[PDB]
Coordinates of C-alpha atoms and ligand atoms in Angstrom, one line a residue:
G8 CA -44.9 -220.9 -113.9
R9 CA -43.2 -223.2 -116.5
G10 CA -41.9 -226.8 -116.8
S11 CA -43.1 -230.1 -115.0
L12 CA -45.2 -229.5 -111.7
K13 CA -43.8 -231.7 -108.9
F14 CA -43.6 -232.3 -105.2
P15 CA -40.3 -232.6 -103.2
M16 CA -41.2 -236.2 -102.7
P17 CA -43.7 -238.6 -104.3
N18 CA -44.7 -239.9 -100.8
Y19 CA -44.5 -239.2 -97.0
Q20 CA -44.8 -241.3 -93.8
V21 CA -46.1 -238.9 -91.1
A22 CA -47.3 -240.4 -87.7
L23 CA -49.4 -238.6 -84.9
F24 CA -50.9 -239.7 -81.6
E25 CA -54.4 -241.5 -81.0
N26 CA -56.4 -238.6 -79.4
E27 CA -55.3 -235.4 -81.0
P28 CA -57.7 -232.5 -80.8
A29 CA -59.5 -232.0 -84.2
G30 CA -57.5 -229.7 -86.7
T31 CA -54.1 -231.0 -85.6
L32 CA -51.8 -229.9 -88.4
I33 CA -49.8 -232.9 -89.9
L34 CA -47.9 -232.0 -93.1
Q35 CA -47.3 -228.7 -95.1
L36 CA -47.0 -229.8 -98.8
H37 CA -45.6 -227.5 -101.5
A38 CA -45.6 -228.2 -105.2
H39 CA -42.8 -226.5 -107.2
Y40 CA -42.4 -226.0 -111.0
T41 CA -39.0 -227.0 -112.5
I42 CA -38.6 -223.3 -113.7
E43 CA -39.9 -220.9 -110.9
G44 CA -43.3 -219.6 -111.9
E45 CA -44.0 -215.8 -112.1
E46 CA -47.8 -216.5 -111.4
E47 CA -47.8 -220.1 -109.8
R48 CA -51.7 -220.6 -109.5
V49 CA -52.1 -223.9 -107.7
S50 CA -55.1 -225.7 -106.1
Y51 CA -54.4 -228.7 -103.7
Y52 CA -56.9 -231.6 -103.3
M53 CA -57.1 -234.9 -101.4
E54 CA -58.9 -238.3 -101.2
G55 CA -58.8 -241.6 -99.3
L56 CA -56.8 -244.0 -101.5
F57 CA -59.1 -247.0 -100.6
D58 CA -62.5 -246.0 -98.9
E59 CA -64.5 -242.7 -99.0
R60 CA -64.9 -242.6 -95.1
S61 CA -61.1 -242.5 -94.4
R62 CA -61.1 -239.2 -96.5
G63 CA -63.7 -237.9 -94.0
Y64 CA -61.2 -237.9 -91.1
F65 CA -58.8 -235.3 -92.7
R66 CA -58.8 -232.0 -94.5
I67 CA -56.5 -229.9 -96.8
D68 CA -56.6 -226.1 -97.3
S69 CA -57.1 -226.1 -101.1
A70 CA -54.9 -222.8 -101.0
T71 CA -51.8 -224.2 -99.2
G72 CA -50.6 -227.8 -98.6
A73 CA -52.3 -227.6 -95.1
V74 CA -53.2 -231.2 -93.9
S75 CA -55.2 -231.5 -90.6
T76 CA -57.5 -234.0 -88.8
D77 CA -61.3 -233.3 -89.5
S78 CA -61.9 -235.3 -86.2
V79 CA -59.9 -236.7 -83.2
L80 CA -58.2 -240.0 -84.4
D81 CA -58.2 -243.4 -82.5
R82 CA -55.8 -246.2 -83.2
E83 CA -58.1 -249.2 -82.2
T84 CA -60.6 -247.8 -84.8
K85 CA -57.9 -247.4 -87.6
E86 CA -54.1 -247.8 -87.1
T87 CA -53.1 -246.2 -90.5
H88 CA -54.9 -243.9 -93.0
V89 CA -53.4 -243.5 -96.5
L90 CA -54.3 -240.3 -98.4
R91 CA -53.5 -239.2 -102.0
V92 CA -53.1 -235.5 -102.7
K93 CA -52.9 -233.7 -106.1
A94 CA -51.8 -230.2 -107.2
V95 CA -53.6 -228.6 -110.2
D96 CA -52.8 -225.7 -112.5
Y97 CA -55.0 -223.4 -114.7
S98 CA -52.4 -223.5 -117.6
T99 CA -53.9 -224.2 -121.0
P100 CA -52.1 -227.6 -121.0
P101 CA -53.3 -228.1 -117.3
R102 CA -50.6 -229.5 -114.9
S103 CA -50.8 -232.2 -112.1
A104 CA -48.3 -233.3 -109.4
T105 CA -49.4 -236.4 -107.5
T106 CA -48.4 -237.4 -103.9
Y107 CA -49.2 -240.0 -101.2
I108 CA -49.4 -239.6 -97.3
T109 CA -49.1 -242.7 -95.0
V110 CA -50.5 -241.4 -91.6
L111 CA -49.7 -243.8 -88.7
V112 CA -51.8 -243.3 -85.5
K113 CA -49.9 -244.0 -82.1
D114 CA -51.5 -245.4 -78.8
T115 CA -52.4 -243.1 -75.8
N116 CA -53.6 -245.6 -73.0
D117 CA -57.2 -244.4 -73.7
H118 CA -58.7 -247.9 -72.5
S119 CA -58.4 -249.2 -68.8
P120 CA -57.9 -253.0 -68.0
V121 CA -61.2 -255.0 -68.0
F122 CA -61.7 -258.1 -65.7
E123 CA -63.1 -261.2 -67.5
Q124 CA -65.4 -261.5 -64.4
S125 CA -66.7 -258.3 -62.5
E126 CA -66.3 -260.2 -59.1
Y127 CA -64.9 -263.7 -58.3
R128 CA -67.1 -266.1 -56.1
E129 CA -64.5 -268.7 -55.0
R130 CA -63.9 -271.2 -52.1
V131 CA -60.9 -272.8 -50.4
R132 CA -60.9 -275.7 -47.9
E133 CA -59.2 -275.4 -44.5
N134 CA -56.1 -277.2 -43.0
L135 CA -54.9 -277.0 -46.7
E136 CA -51.1 -276.8 -47.1
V137 CA -49.3 -273.5 -47.6
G138 CA -49.0 -271.9 -51.2
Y139 CA -52.2 -273.6 -52.5
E140 CA -53.3 -272.2 -55.9
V141 CA -56.8 -270.9 -55.0
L142 CA -57.9 -269.1 -58.2
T143 CA -56.5 -266.9 -61.1
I144 CA -57.7 -263.4 -62.1
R145 CA -57.5 -262.2 -65.7
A146 CA -58.1 -258.7 -67.1
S147 CA -57.6 -257.2 -70.7
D148 CA -56.8 -253.8 -72.1
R149 CA -57.4 -253.1 -75.9
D150 CA -54.3 -250.9 -76.1
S151 CA -50.8 -251.2 -77.6
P152 CA -48.8 -253.6 -75.5
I153 CA -47.1 -250.9 -73.5
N154 CA -50.5 -249.5 -72.3
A155 CA -51.5 -253.2 -71.4
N156 CA -48.4 -254.5 -69.5
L157 CA -50.9 -255.7 -66.7
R158 CA -49.7 -255.8 -63.0
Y159 CA -52.2 -257.2 -60.4
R160 CA -51.7 -256.0 -56.7
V161 CA -54.0 -256.7 -53.8
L162 CA -55.2 -253.2 -53.2
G163 CA -56.6 -254.1 -49.7
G164 CA -58.2 -256.9 -47.5
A165 CA -56.6 -260.2 -46.5
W166 CA -53.1 -259.5 -47.8
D167 CA -51.6 -261.1 -44.6
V168 CA -53.5 -264.3 -45.6
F169 CA -53.4 -264.9 -49.4
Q170 CA -50.7 -264.1 -52.1
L171 CA -51.1 -262.7 -55.6
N172 CA -48.5 -263.2 -58.4
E173 CA -48.1 -259.6 -59.7
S174 CA -47.8 -260.9 -63.4
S175 CA -49.5 -264.3 -63.4
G176 CA -52.5 -263.0 -61.4
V177 CA -52.9 -266.2 -59.4
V178 CA -54.3 -266.2 -55.8
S179 CA -52.4 -268.6 -53.5
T180 CA -52.8 -269.4 -49.7
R181 CA -49.8 -267.9 -47.7
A182 CA -50.6 -270.1 -44.6
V183 CA -52.7 -273.2 -43.7
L184 CA -56.4 -271.9 -43.5
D185 CA -58.8 -272.5 -40.5
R186 CA -62.6 -272.0 -41.1
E187 CA -63.3 -271.9 -37.3
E188 CA -60.9 -268.9 -37.1
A189 CA -61.9 -267.3 -40.4
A190 CA -65.4 -267.9 -41.9
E191 CA -65.1 -266.1 -45.3
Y192 CA -62.6 -263.8 -47.0
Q193 CA -62.8 -260.5 -48.7
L194 CA -59.9 -259.1 -50.8
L195 CA -60.0 -256.2 -53.4
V196 CA -57.5 -256.6 -56.3
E197 CA -56.3 -254.0 -58.8
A198 CA -55.2 -254.5 -62.5
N199 CA -52.8 -251.8 -63.6
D200 CA -51.7 -251.0 -67.3
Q201 CA -48.2 -249.8 -66.2
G202 CA -49.4 -247.3 -68.8
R203 CA -46.9 -244.8 -70.3
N204 CA -48.4 -242.5 -73.0
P205 CA -50.5 -240.2 -70.8
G206 CA -49.8 -242.3 -67.7
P207 CA -51.1 -245.6 -66.2
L208 CA -54.7 -246.8 -66.0
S209 CA -56.5 -249.4 -63.7
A210 CA -59.8 -251.0 -62.5
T211 CA -60.6 -253.3 -59.5
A212 CA -62.6 -256.5 -58.6
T213 CA -63.8 -258.0 -55.3
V214 CA -62.8 -261.7 -54.7
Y215 CA -65.0 -263.6 -52.2
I216 CA -63.2 -266.6 -50.9
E217 CA -65.5 -268.8 -48.8
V218 CA -63.5 -271.3 -46.5
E219 CA -64.9 -274.9 -46.7
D220 CA -65.4 -277.1 -43.5
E221 CA -63.5 -280.2 -42.3
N222 CA -64.2 -282.3 -39.2
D223 CA -61.3 -280.9 -37.2
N224 CA -63.0 -279.9 -33.9
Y225 CA -64.2 -282.5 -31.4
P226 CA -67.5 -281.8 -29.6
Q227 CA -66.8 -280.4 -26.1
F228 CA -69.2 -281.2 -23.2
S229 CA -70.9 -278.1 -21.7
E230 CA -70.1 -278.9 -17.9
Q231 CA -67.0 -280.9 -17.0
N232 CA -68.6 -283.2 -14.4
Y233 CA -72.4 -282.8 -14.5
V234 CA -73.5 -283.2 -10.8
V235 CA -77.2 -284.2 -10.2
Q236 CA -79.4 -285.4 -7.3
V237 CA -82.5 -287.7 -7.3
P238 CA -85.0 -288.7 -4.6
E239 CA -85.1 -292.5 -4.4
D240 CA -88.9 -291.8 -4.5
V241 CA -88.8 -290.2 -8.1
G242 CA -91.6 -291.2 -10.6
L243 CA -90.8 -293.3 -13.7
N244 CA -89.8 -291.9 -17.2
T245 CA -89.0 -288.7 -15.5
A246 CA -86.2 -286.3 -16.9
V247 CA -83.2 -285.5 -14.6
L248 CA -80.6 -283.8 -16.9
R249 CA -80.1 -282.4 -20.4
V250 CA -76.4 -283.2 -21.2
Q251 CA -75.3 -280.9 -24.0
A252 CA -72.0 -280.5 -26.0
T253 CA -71.1 -278.2 -28.9
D254 CA -68.9 -278.6 -32.1
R255 CA -67.2 -275.4 -33.4
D256 CA -67.4 -277.1 -36.8
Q257 CA -70.3 -276.6 -39.2
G258 CA -73.0 -278.8 -41.0
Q259 CA -73.2 -282.5 -40.0
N260 CA -69.6 -282.0 -38.5
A261 CA -71.4 -280.3 -35.6
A262 CA -74.5 -282.7 -35.5
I263 CA -74.1 -284.7 -32.2
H264 CA -75.6 -287.9 -30.7
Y265 CA -75.2 -288.8 -27.0
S266 CA -75.1 -292.3 -25.4
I267 CA -73.9 -294.1 -22.1
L268 CA -70.6 -296.0 -21.9
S269 CA -70.7 -297.2 -18.3
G270 CA -72.6 -297.2 -15.1
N271 CA -76.2 -297.6 -16.4
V272 CA -76.2 -301.4 -16.0
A273 CA -79.5 -302.5 -14.4
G274 CA -81.4 -299.8 -16.5
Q275 CA -82.7 -297.1 -14.3
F276 CA -81.6 -294.3 -16.8
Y277 CA -82.2 -293.9 -20.6
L278 CA -80.4 -291.3 -22.7
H279 CA -82.4 -289.7 -25.6
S280 CA -79.6 -289.8 -28.2
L281 CA -80.4 -286.3 -29.8
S282 CA -82.0 -284.5 -26.7
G283 CA -79.1 -285.3 -24.5
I284 CA -81.8 -286.0 -21.9
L285 CA -81.4 -288.4 -18.9
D286 CA -84.6 -290.1 -17.6
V287 CA -84.8 -292.5 -14.7
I288 CA -86.9 -295.2 -16.3
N289 CA -87.1 -297.7 -13.3
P290 CA -87.4 -297.5 -9.5
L291 CA -84.4 -296.2 -7.5
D292 CA -83.7 -297.5 -3.9
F293 CA -81.2 -295.5 -1.8
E294 CA -80.7 -298.6 0.4
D295 CA -79.6 -300.7 -2.7
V296 CA -77.4 -298.0 -4.5
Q297 CA -76.9 -294.4 -3.2
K298 CA -74.8 -293.1 -6.2
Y299 CA -74.3 -293.5 -10.0
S300 CA -71.7 -291.9 -12.2
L301 CA -72.0 -292.8 -15.8
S302 CA -69.7 -291.9 -18.7
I303 CA -71.3 -290.2 -21.6
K304 CA -70.1 -290.1 -25.3
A305 CA -70.7 -287.3 -27.8
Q306 CA -70.1 -288.0 -31.5
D307 CA -69.9 -285.7 -34.7
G308 CA -71.5 -286.7 -37.9
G309 CA -68.4 -286.2 -40.1
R310 CA -66.9 -288.4 -42.8
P311 CA -64.5 -289.3 -40.1
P312 CA -66.8 -288.5 -37.1
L313 CA -65.0 -287.3 -33.9
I314 CA -65.8 -288.5 -30.4
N315 CA -65.6 -287.1 -26.8
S316 CA -66.1 -290.1 -24.4
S317 CA -64.9 -288.1 -21.4
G318 CA -68.5 -287.5 -20.3
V319 CA -69.4 -287.7 -16.7
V320 CA -72.8 -287.4 -14.9
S321 CA -72.1 -288.1 -11.2
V322 CA -75.7 -288.9 -9.9
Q323 CA -76.5 -288.8 -6.1
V324 CA -79.6 -290.6 -4.8
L325 CA -81.3 -289.0 -1.7
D326 CA -83.0 -291.1 1.1
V327 CA -86.8 -291.0 1.9
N328 CA -88.8 -292.6 4.9
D329 CA -89.8 -295.8 2.8
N330 CA -88.4 -298.0 5.7
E331 CA -90.2 -298.2 9.1
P332 CA -88.3 -299.0 12.4
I333 CA -88.1 -302.8 13.1
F334 CA -87.1 -304.6 16.4
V335 CA -84.2 -307.0 17.2
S336 CA -86.7 -309.5 18.7
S337 CA -90.5 -308.6 18.8
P338 CA -91.0 -310.9 21.8
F339 CA -89.2 -309.0 24.7
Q340 CA -88.6 -311.0 28.0
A341 CA -87.4 -309.7 31.3
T342 CA -86.8 -311.0 34.9
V343 CA -86.0 -308.2 37.4
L344 CA -85.2 -309.0 41.1
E345 CA -87.3 -307.0 43.6
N346 CA -84.3 -306.0 45.8
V347 CA -82.5 -304.5 42.7
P348 CA -81.7 -300.8 43.4
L349 CA -83.4 -297.7 41.8
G350 CA -82.1 -296.7 38.3
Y351 CA -81.2 -300.3 37.4
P352 CA -81.1 -301.6 33.8
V353 CA -83.7 -304.3 33.2
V354 CA -83.8 -304.8 29.4
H355 CA -82.5 -303.2 26.2
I356 CA -85.1 -302.3 23.6
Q357 CA -83.3 -302.3 20.2
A358 CA -84.8 -301.6 16.7
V359 CA -83.2 -300.6 13.3
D360 CA -84.2 -298.4 10.4
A361 CA -82.7 -299.4 6.9
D362 CA -83.3 -295.7 6.0
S363 CA -80.3 -293.5 6.2
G364 CA -80.4 -290.1 7.9
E365 CA -82.9 -289.0 10.5
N366 CA -85.1 -291.5 8.7
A367 CA -82.9 -293.9 10.8
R368 CA -82.4 -292.0 14.1
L369 CA -84.7 -293.7 16.6
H370 CA -86.7 -292.2 19.6
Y371 CA -88.0 -294.9 21.9
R372 CA -91.2 -294.5 24.0
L373 CA -93.3 -296.7 26.3
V374 CA -97.1 -297.7 25.8
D375 CA -98.8 -298.9 29.1
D376 CA -97.8 -296.4 39.9
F377 CA -95.7 -297.8 37.0
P378 CA -92.2 -298.8 38.2
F379 CA -90.2 -298.5 34.9
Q380 CA -88.8 -295.7 32.7
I381 CA -87.2 -295.8 29.3
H382 CA -84.1 -294.0 27.8
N383 CA -85.4 -292.2 24.6
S384 CA -81.9 -292.8 23.0
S385 CA -80.3 -296.0 24.5
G386 CA -83.6 -297.8 24.5
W387 CA -82.7 -299.1 28.0
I388 CA -85.7 -299.6 30.4
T389 CA -84.5 -299.0 34.0
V390 CA -86.5 -299.2 37.3
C391 CA -88.2 -296.2 38.9
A392 CA -90.0 -297.1 42.3
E393 CA -89.3 -300.5 43.9
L394 CA -92.1 -303.1 44.0
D395 CA -93.0 -306.6 45.5
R396 CA -94.7 -309.6 43.7
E397 CA -97.9 -309.5 46.1
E398 CA -99.2 -306.1 44.6
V399 CA -97.5 -306.8 41.1
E400 CA -96.0 -310.2 40.0
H401 CA -96.0 -309.7 36.2
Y402 CA -96.0 -306.6 33.8
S403 CA -97.0 -306.5 30.0
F404 CA -96.8 -303.1 28.3
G405 CA -95.5 -302.1 24.9
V406 CA -92.7 -299.9 23.5
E407 CA -92.9 -297.6 20.5
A408 CA -89.9 -296.6 18.3
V409 CA -90.0 -293.6 15.7
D410 CA -87.9 -292.0 12.9
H411 CA -87.1 -288.3 13.2
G412 CA -88.5 -288.5 9.6
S413 CA -90.5 -286.0 7.4
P414 CA -93.5 -288.3 7.5
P415 CA -92.3 -290.0 10.7
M416 CA -92.8 -293.8 10.1
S417 CA -93.0 -295.8 13.4
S418 CA -93.5 -299.4 14.7
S419 CA -94.2 -300.8 18.2
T420 CA -94.1 -304.2 20.0
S421 CA -94.6 -305.5 23.6
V422 CA -92.5 -306.3 26.7
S423 CA -93.0 -308.8 29.6
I424 CA -91.4 -308.3 33.1
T425 CA -91.9 -311.0 35.7
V426 CA -90.7 -309.5 39.2
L427 CA -88.7 -312.2 41.1
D428 CA -88.0 -313.5 44.8
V429 CA -84.9 -312.4 46.7
Ligands
CA508 CA1 -55.2 -246.4 -77.3
CA509 CA1 -54.4 -249.1 -71.6
CA510 CA1 -59.7 -276.0 -38.1
CA511 CA1 -64.0 -277.3 -39.5
CA512 CA1 -66.5 -281.6 -35.5
CA513 CA1 -85.9 -298.3 0.0
CA514 CA1 -85.0 -294.9 2.0
CA515 CA1 -87.5 -294.3 8.1
NA516 NA1 -58.6 -243.8 -78.2

């Protein structure tokens, strides 16, 4: 051609996306002589205005002003390249037109949010007031602010239980907690870009909330009233019952120790404070006391320990043949007339067993032509065939009394009956 070789414009401000498949055309540049050339013979060329490696990411067609990516771009890597392109002429006074491209890469939500911590290992205490700030999640997206407008939702789990601020990302109790109800908690959160450019992006974290204990459950006694039965005859330091209670709480808040409040005056029972184990530790006697009932007290090991002093062990002693029958008056004296009729009461044999049941009930018997008989129950000795002094003046036999007892203890004594004149 002829005249000054130029470009329409000394400089251009194109702008493309972040990921744009290699070879993405950008600008068509055309040099133009002032006086239209018959034989315009024009080479284009290009460089990176600053650093050689920013050149390496574009190309031109030396032939036309074709300007395309030599590789997919990425904003986070470089947010702007700046290129300088020159046209060249084979004229004997060789001609150059000189121009500048400002490329500006745009974001494409290529990155997804990233949690500062892959999973959260956290812990709340129970009977803690509503809306208690438990914990706060953070994530981060290396993307333009519109592909990093983070919004945290509880994807699943406890959602009923705890609350998440969609923006703040702050876990908060939605009701008073209760460990005894609810040991541990699992909830799976989600951080979302609210991404625009291709769409949104997200990644999730598991948050493990462990509920921490508080002495809030009293220890309940296993049986309401623990009924129990001892032979008076029981051997010493012998076990009788294993009182037990349980505390729904955990750690030392469930640790229990037992102890007597009442009824074990005059020893005769010891409570092993950790066993819960009741041992007669001294002789029992049914004839002294037939029955205990002794209140028992179960205690936590908490900061404020709790207490259940509504413990009851109603004990019942059982009789044994330790006592032997024993008479009103061991010397038994009688004076029967001879003319008294048949089946006539002479004397009343009376004995007594301290023992209680059949260990008390007495069968009488006699220990020697004998003119007397004895009632086995009443202990009355009546007459049987008449007699006169001349053949028999005076009688001296015995009488023997017995328990209806397991080993039947018995005792006997003697009776005197002087027959008398009409
Ligand atoms: Ca991006
Ligand atoms: Ca993003
Ligand atoms: Ca509780
Ligand atoms: Ca508790
Ligand atoms: Ca407790
Ligand atoms: Ca006794
Ligand atoms: Ca007895
Ligand atoms: Ca007896
Ligand atoms: Na990218």
